[PDB]
Ligand binder design. Structure first.
Ligand SMILES: C#Cc1ccc(NC(=O)OC[C@]23CN(S(=O)(=O)c4ccc(C(C)(C)C)cc4C)C[C@H]2C[C@H]2C[C@@H]3C2(C)C)cc1
Length: 380
């Protein structure tokens, strides 16, 4: 068993996986210390600052603020979200091609220093704009769309609330499956047929719920706003012809540096359950594996370590198939089916929210088709 345990029931806190919200950051910080009010003002007013053409001049007038007053993980994660949103807005502007190739030192230096501390690249990633970018409206009500808000958006009407929160709610739905993983491995060591079966049925049930949460994206995200507006600010400078050499982080590196924009490969949920169920993805060969491994380096390092530990545990699939046990096989199959359905839905969302709007003004469609078929081929 690779997974380090905090006690007999819970995985080690060193993996930064919360029992209630999973890979998401629990109860995120909403305010920085007063010392950083100037950064908070800009991130909170990004929509009207971009729209009025005021954003860049405001960032250029900022004083240099040291990150030493960011003493705990939560305030460092908030600061990274604040500075990442400001960076995306500074670089892309209004999204018409008037790009900035130099990030000013009063942002670049604290952002790069903070990113070094957190071992995350100096660009907005999933762990910022989804996993840390949320609050409850009422502390005493549950985690539902109606009771939640994001902390930051880029433009009014960009649907970032719907896109980020629905994604967050899928992560939270998966958390109820992630917290069962130690029980799976314990039942395997102990030969507890029923415990393993109930654990797998629980996982499958939570993955099914996650897909029902995913369905909500159509109700909160307009495809034209997403494609023509939000995607601009999730774009990066790796292989981007508008920033062919990357971005200059003034006062941190002399040469421009390339970092990739957002990708679905930054969520740990898919790989977590592919590993658990022994599904090896092959679609797209080395170039796709290289890209996906690169996106794993854009997850929090503790979540990378969790995924690596999972790969070093005994195999659920090998255990199950050897039992002549219809019940274990059916429960395993229910998990695989729920993962196949999630991949299938992911493909249809890419189609409606990227491939189709793009057509109006191929390797991706065939990658997502192959990942779904590899998964379905893992049905025992
Ligand atoms: C910075 C940053 C940044 C901002 C957002 C993301 N989003 C992301 O990784 O979401 C993971 C998803 C997959 N989508 S998605 O709608 O197919 C989706 C997700 C991302 C995009 C991009 C524009 C970033 C390419 C496009 C689409 C269509 C939502 C979410 C729900 C289910 C399927 C997995 C999930 C299991 C949790 C990543 C980086």
């Amino acid at each position: 068993s690779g997974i380090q345990m905090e006690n007999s029931w819970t995985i080690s806190k060193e993996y930064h996986i919360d029992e209630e919200v999973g890979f998401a950051l629990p109860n995120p910080q909403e305010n920085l210390p007063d010392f950083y009010n100037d950064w908070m003002f800009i991130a909170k007013h990004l929509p009207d600052l971009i729209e009025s053409g005021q954003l860049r001049e405001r960032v250029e007038k900022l004083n240099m603020l040291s990150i030493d007053h960011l003493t705990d993980h939560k305030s460092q994660r908030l600061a990274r979200l604040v500075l990442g949103c400001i960076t995306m807005a500074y670089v892309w502007g209004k999204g018409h091609g008037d790009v900035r190739k130099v990030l000013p030192r009063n942002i670049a230096v604290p952002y790069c220093q903070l990113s070094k501390k957190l071992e995350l690249p100096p660009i907005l990633v999933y762990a910022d704009c989804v996993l840390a970018n949320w609050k409850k409206k009422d502390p005493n009500k549950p985690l539902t769309y109606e009771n939640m808000d994001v902390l930051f958006s880029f433009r009014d009407g960009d649907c970032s609330k719907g896109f980020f929160l629905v994604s967050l709610l899928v992560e939270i739905a998966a958390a109820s499956a992630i917290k069962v993983i130690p029980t799976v491995f314990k039942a395997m060591q102990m030969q507890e047929r029923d415990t393993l079966l109930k654990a797998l049925l629980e996982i499958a049930s939570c993955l099914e719920k996650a897909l029902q949460v995913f369905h909500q994206i159509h109700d909160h995200v307009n495809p034209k706003a997403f494609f023509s507006v939000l995607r601009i600010y999730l774009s990066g400078w790796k292989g981007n012809p508008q920033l062919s050499d990357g971005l200059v982080y003034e006062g941190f590196w002399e040469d421009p540096k390339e970092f990739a924009g957002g990708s679905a490969g930054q969520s740990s949920v898919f790989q977590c359950f592919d590993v658990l169920l022994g599904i090896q993805q092959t679609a797209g060969g080395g170039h796709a594996a290289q890209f996906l491994q690169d996106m794993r380096r854009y997850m929090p390092p503790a979540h990378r370590n969790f995924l690596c530990s999972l790969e070093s545990n005994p195999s659920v699939r090998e255990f199950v198939l050897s039992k002549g046990d219809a019940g274990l096989r059916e429960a395993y199959d229910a998990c695989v089916k729920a993962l196949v359905s999630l991949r299938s839905y992911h493909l249809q969302i890419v189609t409606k929210y990227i491939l189709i709007p793009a057509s109006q003004q191929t390797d991706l469609m065939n990658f997502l088709k192959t990942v779904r078929s590899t998964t379905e081929k893992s049905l025992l």
